[PDB]
């Protein structure tokens, strides 16, 4: 009867910037997956492989909960085999992803008149992200061929740019909070069942 602490992920006061996406490992508890999908609070709830349709029946070794904030137009990049700035430079799901993607509008919270510039993203990177990789580097990107010496200038750009979230922006430019649930199945006790 030890419930799984989904409240700490979904109702957290502040979320992470997508480049430094936050991972919470869930273990040894009971998760009622039918409460979330049947709460009608989320604008996006697509599951890949597993079925959100009461497949809480199944047991899993470890459930991971990744949480970050992006803009509404970018939620489509949180999906297998999708390209873009987020999916190539911030948060890459694998091609055989078995889990769910959840997201909801956060304009009420993460939008401030004048602009909330606390959420960021990676705009430049030498190569794409391996699945579930996390890069929090602040090394100056060298676009040309002359070393930047750690300061931006011509063809030398600071690789992180700030989401400017305002309440009057369009839906696609509005902030959205995203929670990705990874279901891991190893040769192990399988402590997360949640009938």
């Amino acid at each position: 009867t030890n419930l799984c602490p989904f409240g700490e992920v979904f109702n957290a006061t502040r979320f992470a910037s997508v480049y430094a996406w936050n991972r919470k490992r869930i273990s040894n508890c009971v998760a009622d997956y039918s409460v979330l999908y049947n709460s009608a609070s989320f604008s996006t709830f697509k599951c890949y492989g597993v079925s959100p349709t009461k497949l809480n029946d199944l047991c899993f070794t470890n459930v991971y909960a990744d949480s970050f904030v992006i803009r509404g137009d970018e939620v489509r990049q949180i999906a297998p085999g999708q390209t873009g700035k987020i999916a190539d430079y911030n948060y890459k799901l694998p091609d055989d992803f078995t889990g769910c993607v959840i997201a909801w509008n956060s304009n009420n919270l993460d939008s401030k008149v004048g602009g909330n510039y606390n959420y960021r993203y990676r705009l430049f990177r030498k190569s794409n992200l391996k699945p579930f990789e996390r890069d929090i580097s602040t090394e100056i990107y060298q676009a040309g061929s002359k070393p930047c010496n750690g300061v931006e200038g011509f063809n030398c750009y600071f690789p992180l740019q700030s989401y400017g979230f305002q309440p009057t922006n369009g839906v696609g430019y509005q902030p959205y909070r995203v929670v990705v649930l990874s279901f891991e199945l190893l040769h192990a006790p399988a402590t997360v069942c949640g009938p």
């Binding site: 676009a143 369009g170 839906v171």
Partner: protein, 596 residues
């Protein structure tokens, strides 16, 4: 590691930083326009100054990527749009003088006042007094006063300034590797590097002229019909074979002949279609107006307004303490924010305007997915052409009947059909010669083809020959009457009004063909016609990403400007005019002048 790839990356950083900085300016400048305060006058300026200084900072960096080495055409467009030296190509001392002259001229026009003879106390500005006299009064001697005094006390101040304005503007354009300042202005229509869709800067003059030649028969008849009807109204003053006296044309500058309708109405007893009384009878408010406009666009397959539109637009005057600039304007703030500022009343003229302004919104939404430097109409005339074709459809009797504002017992007879087309001809056709001639005078002045000691002599030679308009009083070279108009002394290219006019009927005809309209183009409604909507939309999304010729071709199937649609639009008035002037002289004689 190519120079192109670097610029792609360079441009990539620019776009994301630019959108936010533009928003801060747009939102603040939206506050002053909605809520005039000395506080926001200063807030508007602070955001615009940071955005003006960011673009000057980015323009400099962009030139480090030389266009010659860029091959991706969509990279080169954005790069080139940001590599505009502008007035900066000039010495600071000169670029500081040109800005002084420009501001001096803008101050003289907008503050220029004319006072009564024999009563220095009594004075009249262009607005509201002088414009009233020219546009509504009916006294030759009175009108001559307002027409002449405006050009004598405001034009003469502008004459030495306009001469120095021509020197510096030509220096800035030659340094920017253009022939003269006119060639610079013609650059908005230039297209390079696209096989089969290029366009030369000079080709505009050609295609402007080659299409004006086809208007002359329709204008010549409209002119001889207006001259015939003016001759009944001032008999001792007008020649039946001469040009029309300038002051008698309904504007101080004789641009639009619209206000002459009262005198030229074909069938005076039959009234015009005014659904204003019907709107008040059904208790329509401003929100019902814009709601019906939304429903119109949706009926052709276009999206409804964003929620941010309904929440953030100002569609009714707050009034009272909160003053606001009430000129109907469509805002594209970016980041998805689309707004219309409009102090809407419940009239027919503001019902159409609500469609017209929302037309801009649709164009702004359609190309918003394009890059930031490519979110604009194909050329300077495309955006205003899209807006116009909306109030073409929205005002037809067929459309007004379908929304319950025009009684089902009203039926178009051939007489009300002519009255309307004349009003349209007085405004649409009337301005085209004035517009082509005014820009041709300037194109030549900048070109050097007209010397300083013949500016006014060559101005009124072309008014007589091209426009059929003769000055009531002889004018020296102390005058600078082309500068008595806002657009010339405020440094605005004027050919757009010509090009945009030919554009909107090409548009209208192509779309109404998709609607399979049967009959004259005069009474077409593109409502309930998704095929028309898709064809228009195929061009809307392009923005500036594709050359304006390929943009036009997406709607109409031709790569260039043609006046035939405009003529087709007016053909029933053209043949009615050709049956009203049988025993009247169609043409003008250059020499006749009312000033002996």
């Amino acid at each position: 590691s190519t120079i192109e790839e670097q610029a792609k990356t360079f441009l990539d950083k620019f776009n994301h930083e630019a959108e936010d900085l533009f928003y801060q300016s747009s939102l603040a400048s939206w506050n002053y326009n909605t809520n005039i305060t000395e506080e926001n006058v200063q807030n508007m300026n602070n955001a615009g100054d940071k955005w003006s200084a960011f673009l000057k900072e980015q323009s400099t960096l962009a030139q480090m990527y030389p266009l010659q080495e860029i091959q991706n055409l969509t990279v080169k467009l954005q790069l080139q749009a940001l590599q505009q030296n502008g007035s900066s190509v000039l010495s600071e001392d000169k670029s500081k003088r040109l800005n002084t002259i420009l501001n001096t001229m803008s101050t003289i026009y907008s503050t220029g006042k004319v006072c009564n003879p024999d009563n220095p106390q009594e004075c009249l500005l262009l607005e509201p007094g002088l414009n009233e006299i020219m546009a509504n009064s009916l006294d030759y001697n009175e009108r001559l006063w307002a027409w002449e005094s405006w050009r004598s006390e405001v034009g003469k101040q502008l004459r030495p300034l306009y001469e120095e304005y021509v020197v510096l503007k030509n220096e800035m354009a030659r340094a920017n590797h253009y022939e003269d300042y006119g060639d610079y202005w013609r650059g908005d229509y230039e297209v390079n590097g696209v096989d089969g869709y290029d366009y030369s800067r000079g080709q505009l003059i050609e295609d402007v002229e080659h299409t004006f030649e086809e208007i002359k028969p329709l204008y010549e008849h409209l002119h001889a019909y207006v001259r015939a009807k003016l001759m009944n109204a001032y008999p001792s003053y007008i020649s039946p074979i001469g040009c029309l006296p300038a002051h008698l044309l309904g504007d101080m500058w004789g641009r639009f002949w619209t206000n002459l309708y009262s005198l030229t109405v074909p069938f005076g007893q039959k009234p015009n279609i005014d659904v204003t009384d019907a709107m008040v009878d059904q208790a329509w408010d401003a929100q019902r107006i814009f709601k019906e406009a939304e429903k119109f666009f949706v009926s052709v397959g276009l999206p409804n307004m964003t929620q941010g539109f309904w929440e953030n637009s100002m569609l009714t005057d707050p009034g009272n303490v909160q003053k606001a600039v009430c000129h109907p304007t469509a805002w594209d703030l970016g980041k998805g924010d689309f707004r219309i500022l409009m102090c809407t009343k419940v009239t027919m003229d503001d019902f159409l305007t609500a469609h017209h302004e929302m037309g801009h919104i649709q164009y702004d939404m359609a190309y918003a997915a394009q890059p930031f430097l490519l979110r604009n109409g194909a050329n300077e005339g495309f955006h205003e052409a899209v807006g116009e074709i909306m109030s073409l459809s929205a005002a037809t009797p067929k459309h007004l009947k379908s929304i319950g504002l025009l009684s089902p017992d009203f039926q178009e007879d051939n007489e009300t059909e002519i009255n309307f087309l004349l009003k349209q001809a007085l405004t649409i056709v009337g301005t085209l010669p004035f517009t082509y001639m005014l820009e041709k005078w300037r194109w030549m002045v900048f070109k050097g083809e007209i010397p300083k000691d013949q500016w006014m002599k060559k101005w009124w030679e072309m008014k007589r020959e091209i426009v059929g308009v003769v000055e009531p009083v002889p004018h020296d070279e102390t005058y600078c009457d082309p500068a008595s108009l806002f657009h010339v002394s405020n440094d605005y290219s004027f050919i757009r009004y010509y090009t945009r006019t030919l554009y909107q009927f090409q548009f209208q005809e192509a779309l109404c063909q998709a609607a399979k309209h049967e009959g004259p183009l005069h009474k077409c409604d593109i409502s309930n016609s998704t095929e028309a909507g898709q064809k228009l939309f195929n061009m809307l999304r392009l923005g500036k990403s594709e050359p304006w010729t390929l943009a036009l071709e997406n709607v109409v199937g031709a790569k260039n400007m043609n006046v035939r649609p405009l003529l087709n639009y007016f053909e029933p008035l053209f043949t009615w005019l050709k049956d009203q002037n049988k025993n009247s002289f169609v043409g003008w004689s250059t020499d006749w002048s009312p000033y002996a």
